[PDB]
Symmetry: D4
Subunit: 242 residues, 8 copies
């Protein structure tokens, strides 16, 4: 069971929206990445459409050769959109202060009914749901209890570690959380903030299923090209596992 990699192309759109032209087109990047080590493409459809737009989602859904992971907030609009779109995966994320925790994860343990409804609903649509949460066992437990098949652990605190001791600390937390989530029947993803220098430690955690990385790749891309940027990340990820 190879460690999978989902490439988030959101920032290709960031770059496009700055001038309101058609380029660069997320649709092209998706092709490059899928053929360069990406097992899935991730797009976050924000409410304010900062980058990825409804057009993007609509055409990508028809052009992706692998599968879509729709990052979105738990709101009527987005729930409706995802059910309509039928993405293979859906990643629920906070987008406001009430749904967010002190670390930026989805507050599941405090919104059990809302999350329960959302999960069954997305599941009836044939969508595999992933609740984006902190390496918090309480949230991890609640996630399991509301029926999500996946949870994506927030690796941002780890990415932003200011000292090695602080980083090693966040690593351990993440690792124990993953092990705990698995013992609950959850498959577990991570990836937020991961870079070419801190990706290996996470990739090594056995419970990890897939890593959703975006920015570091797109940031490497402007220099070296998307093909090599994605390929390097996948190479490093597999090395971590061997």
């Amino acid at each position: 069971a190879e460690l999978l990699l989902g490439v988030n192309i959101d920032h290709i759109a960031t770059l496009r929206n700055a001038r309101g032209t058609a380029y660069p087109d997320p649709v092209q990047a998706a092709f490059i990445a899928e053929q360069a080590g990406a097992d899935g493409i991730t797009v976050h459809l924000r409410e304010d459409r900062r980058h990825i737009t409804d057009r993007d989602v609509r055409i990508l859904r028809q052009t992706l050769d692998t599968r879509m992971n729709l990052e979105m907030a738990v709101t009527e609009e987005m729930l409706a959109i995802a059910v309509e779109t039928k993405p293979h995966f859906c990643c629920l994320v906070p987008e406001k202060r009430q749904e967010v925790t002190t670390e930026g994860g989805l507050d599941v343990a405090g919104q059990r009914d809302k999350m329960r409804d959302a999960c069954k609903r997305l599941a009836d649509a044939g969508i595999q749901v992933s609740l984006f949460i902190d390496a918090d066992e309480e949230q991890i437990k609640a996630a399991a209890e509301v029926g999500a098949p996946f949870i994506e652990i927030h690796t941002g605190c780890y990415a932003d570690a200011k000292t090695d001791a602080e980083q090693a600390q966040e690593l351990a937390r993440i690792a124990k959380a993953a092990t705990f989530a698995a013992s609950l029947g959850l498959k577990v993803n991570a990836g937020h903030g991961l870079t070419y220098h801190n990706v290996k430690a996470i990739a090594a955690i056995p419970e990890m299923h897939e890593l959703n990385i975006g920015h570091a790749i797109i940031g490497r891309a402007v220099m070296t090209g998307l093909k090599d940027a994605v390929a390097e990340m996948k190479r490093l990820m597999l090395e971590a596992r061997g």
Copy 2:
């Protein structure tokens, strides 16, 4: 006298500022482009520091191997900064509705004193000033009258042409403006909005001195890498001239 190309790296910073990390770093891109066909690097130091930051300007000024073109508004702050920085070039641009025209060019013909002061001031600092203006002969004339050594014609209307007839129209206007500006002792640049498909027609206009292109290059870069993106643009630009 080879047609020169200045690569605007602003959007590398756009990409960086989206997540507040250090990468991608404009400093790296500047190296790649200078060695890939760029005769100068252009950075726009906006008042709100959307992308390029004071850090950027400060280090770039020490790392560029060619020369800096500081795009900036005519305000006390920016005038002070540029005098302090001593860029080789300075490109005055509108950033508000009063300094802008109906086309987005710097309103020179209506602010002669402000522009006159700015030009002599930047010139005393040893800076070669370029007034960013529309292909308007009135503005072109005023630009000459206030003492600017350069003017950069706004090629955006041309870039955004919706029909070929409309485009050919904007081309002619641009070409006659350039010829007119030259007969006034001005050296003339262009470049805003130019892309890999419409760059040749502009590059062919003999009066053109240097083209300041940014977005299309950076947008091509996320796919192919900055090296080739800059090189392709310079290749197309020189073909236009032969």
Copy 3:
């Protein structure tokens, strides 16, 4: 301007339809071509949707950064599809033997009424029409009379030339045909069957506006990759005109 390259990506889809998978996708090929030297993308919507399908046209129309040239037979179905799709260019080709001539181009001189009608109806939709015809003065004069802004000379016979003498003769004929056509106010294209070894003599012809090439490019792509295949064809074309 300079000789333009219209890349026909039909065979990308013949490879696809040979299996029923979604790969390779013409949408990707189009992006690669548009960035490798192609000034337009061409697709031939056959009545039997043998390669290019309606889905290809619908999506391509939204993804192309340049413009679409739609080759199609002159039937109510296609004209309706074409009027609705609104591509920049349209090239009317024969699909049935009662449509073809001795050498293989559209038969305009014999179907002036239908052709006059088509041209009018497509031009009304804002589409610029081109009639694919043999290097035949009769057909060329008729193309003009019916209102077409373009004609595309069928370069097959020249590409199929079995001897050096037969080739030089076909060449001369194409060139004299092009000049005549121009004298009638027509803009002229070509490209069918053109290859890496025989494209220069055609590109050297001054009246040539755009060369639409497919098979030879795709044929080189399977070995080399589309990016280089296209850039090569383009390079050769511009060398011929210098």
Copy 4:
């Protein structure tokens, strides 16, 4: 233990044939592939020679540097050619409806006389025979009972699996079919319809001797070139066993 890759270049030919030209030439693709990770080259010599032709087989036979794997229907014409051509391997496949099962595999269970004879005849010419069958125990036993050295499991259903569950269900089917086939002294292959995204789980299966892949490889090749298409596939395969 060392997983071999067998590249099928049939679709290089389909491309060519869609036009009647000499290119792209299968003979070229074989050199490229044999030097990019291919251990053998496969060609399916169909009755209607829709792609690979008698010339191809005649020249490929004198130009391959590794070995030929002739795919063919069980007929007198083919057996006769195979015996004469003396290819290293031979893969008996269904071309007609009365010789194919309900899922696609060659119907050996229901043609034991025909197959027993094919095998003895081909084996008598020093050709190692493989029967292209479904992952079905009844067919595998017939295969062994008749004497074939090899069998090639049809991964068609696994490749076409719509849901993840449906895919895992089909994987287990193949893996148990292979283990079983091995217990009866058969060497087992696969490959039909495998892609850069599903090949690994099949390559992980121990009993696999050689994987015969074609379409996905050629489909990647029109984009990246045959060399990298072939080298990637090989790399993924060995990664799966590592």
Copy 5:
């Protein structure tokens, strides 16, 4: 018109023959070079089949996409092989003491009877003949009387030029000889011995039709690979005429 390049791939077979293996296979080099700047492929079927063998010719004749230039001695064996093979071109070269010049080229002045017969016989077969001679007037007049449509000047002496004077003189000798041949209605070629550093002076000679180079190309190819080697040669040649 277009200055052409014939690539002699003889030395590919030279590397092969030093071992009795099948690699490297001339057939592969051919595809590579024709797709990288070669306009024709040249092979010299020596009597002793030192490198090129009958199978090479037999198969190349079937795989070449451009055309064959068969270099050969004048012997009944070779004339029959040539008439059977029907290569597009035939270059008659000296292989024995009695047929050579002290300078190395074919002694046509001394074998007027033989050569006349060869030119006629090869001509009725539809083969364009070239005589490999020295930049000598007597041999050129001989070549002319005998009926050869082409001549290939021996650029050997120029290539081994020891001083800058010695070289400039041989250059001049060829330039005049080429003009002399043309005034006689002969088309002229050269190439033998030409390298990456001395080719341009020869390519610049107006009367030159095609350059038949092999050894310096193969010698560069062992380091950089055939493709770039061939492409690089072609480029230097085109640079010479620009």
Copy 6:
């Protein structure tokens, strides 16, 4: 430990010597290969200096960054050259009828006196000696008694193996012979005749110390360039031991 690769660059000089030119120059190949996977460079100073010449050895001895493996016949001339040259290694090979085996390797069992003298004399000079012998016990015992520290098994017969049976047997023969040699205190090498498709089985033999390959590498290099050719071989070797 590390399985090593000695690259025989003899055939570089073979291409050169076919013309008396200075290119390709063995000295260049050496730098290329040592920097691409070679751990040593091997040259065979034949008596007739067919390829490698004294200057090659004289200069290589000065430019090599790793070390020289001098292949040579046992003659007073060569022993003196070797003692003078002081290459790190010396591989004694058969060049005349009286010194060869019907299989091709050095006949040590038949020249015990001569070989013993060579090993001692070359040894006092500080050269590690290897005897090029067949995978034969009598020759190995002979090599052992005479004092040679190394032996290089002749993988020729295995390389020219006609069937999969013939090959598997020669493999087995070498594997056992290698173990036999080691039990005698000899270090063992091989390589001759090994290609990109048969090298792995040999590299996997535990007792193998270094593989001295040349011809298949040069033969691949003519197409792809030395660097990738060498690097690719090295990789296959490392893959074999993993």
Copy 7:
């Protein structure tokens, strides 16, 4: 973690200072290395600023995406510079002969007071200290006693080993030294003089934390380019530990 690579870019600046230009700039090299396999960048601020200057350190400190390892002599000037610069790592090296030992590493066992002081003062600035010393137990025990968290074993002698025996001996010594050092709670690095051909034996040593390499990498960069030079060194290092 995995063996880390510390790339020393000092020689980038020795190339620069050899002329007084601004190129090549170490700032660029650092970016290339950080993206090619380097986990840290090393610079040696010599008292004579022979290559790396203060400007290099000041800017690098702001541009590096990983972390700075500053090599420096133990003087008040450097310590003050180091305390202020706050690099992640500091490696104390001898610059004067009253600082060096027999083999060339720092002399800690003889200057325990100064070293205890340094370590304390640098650790107080938050810098992690490493003492560059020979593979000498006495020096290692003293490094520990004075408080250093790291030591870097001087691999020069092993890299300079004039014979295989001298090399294996130096190796064994380094390995035994590393183990001892570890038993004292010290983390151990190495790398001086390490090359592409001798780096594996050192990387294979388990106690090795990071390898700091410069000269050999830069030496390969002038030929190959930094990106590949680094990626190669890295590749070799990770192969050694697998």
Copy 8:
């Protein structure tokens, strides 16, 4: 008319020497450069052999495939070596203060006896001599009066020009100096300190025969590799003349 490029590989050696190793080796750089656009290779054999050494010159002389240009001070030691070494070109340069003018050039005007003798002596050994002088009429006349075939104008001041005006002033100086030098029968060169950014204006100057560049090329090479560094420079030079 055909501008030649002469690459100086002195700094490849400075790199090497800064460490006492064998690499990087100048012999390697010369092959790379000679095959990437260099028409000759230059080496400055200084008195203190700080970079290029007697070994280098001795081996480079037997390995160059184009020709050697020996830069040296006018002394007995050097003349003697030059005469023996028999380099194709020789460039007399100042190494001491009493032999250099106020701007840098060789003082010929003030050492007519010394120079007249050097020239006659070197010329007597078949060496073409060039005097490295300033763009100063007094020195150019002395150069011609003494007999030197060539002169190499020192572009040092133009390269170091601080302001644009100062640069144009220095350019005109060089261009008039060259035209003048030409009128006296001298062949004129340049190159010192030229970069990828200022080389073109110098290459545009008609009278220029060969440009000798080194530092900028090697400085680009540590980043991109010597091949592209050399090929870019050549490309820019020819673009300037085109």
